[PDB]
Design a protein around this ligand. Structure first.
Ligand SMILES: N[C@@H](Cc1ccccc1)C(=O)O
Lengths: 147, 147
């Protein structure tokens, strides 16, 4: 239940999250009221989860990023790694994954030594072994596709 | 230098990219003309890179996400895989990495069947071998942290 109009709306809003209701109304052939109300239904049905500025991580002092794959030191202990790691602010994302590892994290940090301290924090807070893959360059990211 | 009132602004806009320049000014303690001019300057030094609505991928038909680690088949050839894959819309992100593979992609697709098709297209269009790690669930993503 996403009609043609809604796909247009989410496509425009993925490319430009600050687009005004009136720019959107003219692209969709709707009134500004019609647009607001379709946008409110997109948000409350959880199709649109929120809006963010895309911040350049380097510009704010995050000069090093990494994938960290984690696996429980004790797989019989309950499985709450994501909730435990939620209070660690340098953890930007957490996915559960098929394979030998349990979770993959994306982590951002100021430097190599800051990474070594963060890995210790991640091993003790989730009781986990870590396998780190350092990112050397981001060619493009977050390019959301609406088919 | 990021004039740490500037840190309040990026912090606020990362959390709510549809914040208004006036509902901002009160939260930061400035005047619409200052707020507006910083934001335009932040956008000009590529600190804020865009604004986007965060779309739920499964709401839109992408019921299968995967990391796809790729490595060029022939190292005598120019390594231009990111440029070559850029036109493939199901690739959301591309990173070079220090690990076992040369690059990691984040890919989104309708089904396991559609992934197999996509992996064939990736192999033939960029001349790479692939290795996919299927995501089961996303616990949180894109929590941009501003120190
Ligand atoms: N990696 C496990 C799935 C899993 C993820 C996270 C926690 C526990 C299990 C598998 O391939 O079956």
């Amino acid at each position: 239940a996403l009609d043609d109009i809604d796909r247009i709306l989410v496509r425009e809003l993925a490319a430009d999250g600050r687009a005004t209701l009136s720019e959107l109304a003219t692209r969709a052939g709707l009134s500004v009221s019609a647009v607001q109300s379709r946008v409110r239904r997109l948000e409350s049905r959880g199709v649109v989860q929120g809006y963010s500025a895309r911040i350049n991580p380097e510009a704010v002092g995050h000069l090093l990023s990494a994938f960290v794959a984690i696996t429980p030191l004790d797989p019989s202990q309950p499985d709450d790694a994501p909730a435990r790691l939620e209070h660690i602010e340098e953890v930007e994302s957490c996915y559960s994954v098929a394979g030998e590892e349990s979770y993959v994290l994306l982590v951002r940090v100021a430097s190599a030594r800051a990474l070594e301290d963060l890995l210790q924090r991640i091993r003790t807070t989730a009781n986990v072994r870590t396998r780190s893959t350092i990112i050397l360059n981001t060619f493009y990211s977050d390019r959301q596709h609406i088919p």
